[PDB]
Design a protein around this ligand. Structure first.
Ligand SMILES: C/C(=C\CNc1ncnc2c1ncn2[C@@H]1O[C@H](CO)[C@@H](O)[C@H]1O)CO
Length: 377
């Protein structure tokens, strides 16, 4: 039958299909090409995607997300210890492995990470089925280049639970390289700079006569666009307290409304120099009305932007490469749309321009759908 392509991201997923020589990245039921990797277990209903993410504000212990950080790992791994301290839903030790515990109609219910990832995959599968008007039983699914066999197998198991045979796992840098059509002839060294909503990954990908190999990987598992929004949140929470004697952190609903407008303002500031952040009655009887400039957006985040170069230096050192050896730079993730990020990368590479796309959050799924096409011939 069909083989679809799915980017199973830390913060979001994305599904493409390959049909009539075209890749189509598909809209979810809300009209969006990326779906938050969230599942909520509230009041006897299970929700997946944006409807689940919206439950996080009032039901933080029931709203599961970032399960990609746990999948195929051990409970005592230092990364999983840090993630348990950050994540609001209960994580329990099941015979050495992290499991997620929530309540369904008050009953304690414990899921493997792959069971929660399966729910995300099932939703992506259903989008493909509605679009193709036929069942889908097969997929290409992406993983991070640094995933080990246990992490890849757990991802395959998520597919099996979702009724998907994962015919091939490909790494996220290879998927991006396919999407951008990087010339497969001869030898090319590529720096894949992938700055998403929650995670930063850098890879040196070598393409040699059609063979893809990731020579080195490095990153920052807690650096992404959400952190840039939080720097802005922190600044306007201080300001609103100074002006109004209201600490917005005292009202969870106010924080949720602020985060949504700050994310919009941040995106506007990739295009314009100044934008208004407006929320009527952010609490009852008090409007939020602020201007944010690109300059202040950059000042609030400059240290985090510059931090992204530390993994770039590490992979060049791991690969024993000089900057000159990189032939092209491919940007992945919505956060690479920030002008200052591009300028910092361009400048580090002693002036060389980074290659980039137009829909960098869809490039991985697009390449997974190409891989699906390559496998069908
Ligand atoms: C219109 C245009 C640029 C404006 N867009 C963006 N500017 C900055 N960050 C962005 C943008 N798009 C997605 N992200 C983040 O990417 C992460 C992964 O979803 C999330 O943190 C998003 O906030 C120029 O084409």
């Amino acid at each position: 039958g069909p083989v679809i392509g799915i980017d199973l991201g830390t913060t979001y997923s994305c599904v493409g299909v390959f049909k009539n020589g075209r890749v189509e990245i598909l809209n979810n039921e809300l009209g969006n090409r990326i779906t938050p990797s969230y599942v909520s277990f509230v009041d006897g209903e299970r929700k997946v995607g944006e409807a689940a993410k919206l439950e996080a504000t009032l039901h933080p212990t029931q709203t599961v997300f970032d399960v990609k950080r746990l999948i195929g790992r051990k409970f005592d791994d230092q990364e999983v210890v840090k993630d348990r301290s950050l994540l609001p839903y209960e994580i329990v030790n099941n015979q050495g492995k992290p499991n997620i515990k929530v309540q369904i109609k008050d009953k304690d219910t414990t899921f493997a990470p792959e069971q929660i990832s399966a729910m995300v995959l099932e939703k992506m599968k259903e989008i493909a089925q509605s679009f193709l008007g036929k069942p889908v039983k097969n997929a290409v699914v992406t993983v991070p280049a640094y995933f080990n066999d246990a992490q890849r197998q757990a991802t395959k198991d998520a597919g099996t639970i979702a009724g998907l045979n994962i015919v091939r796992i490909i790494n996220e840098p290879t998927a991006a390289a396919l999407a951008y059509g990087l010339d497969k002839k001869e030898e090319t060294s590529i720096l894949v700079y992938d700055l998403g909503g929650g995670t930063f990954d850098v890879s040196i990908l070598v393409i040699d006569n059609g063979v893809f190999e990731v020579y080195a990987t490095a990153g920052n598992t807690h650096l992404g666009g959400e952190d840039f929004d939080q720097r802005v949140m922190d600044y306007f929470i201080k300001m609103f307290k100074k002006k109004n004697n209201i600490d917005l952190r005292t009202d969870k609903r106010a924080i949720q409304k602020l985060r949504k407008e700050v994310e919009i303002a941040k995106r506007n500031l990739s295009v314009v120099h100044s934008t208004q952040i407006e929320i009527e009655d952010i609490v009852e009887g008090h409007n939020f009305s602020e201007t944010l400039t690109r300059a202040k957006f950059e000042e609030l985040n400059d240290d985090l932007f510059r931090e992204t170069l530390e993994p770039v230096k590490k992979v060049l050192d791991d690969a024993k490469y000089e900057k000159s050896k990189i032939d092209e730079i491919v940007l992945v993730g919505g956060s690479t749309r920030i002008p200052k990020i591009q300028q910092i990368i361009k400048e580090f590479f002693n002036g060389k321009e980074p290659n980039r796309g137009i829909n960098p959050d869809e490039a991985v799924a697009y390449g997974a759908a190409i891989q699906a096409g390559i496998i069908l011939g």
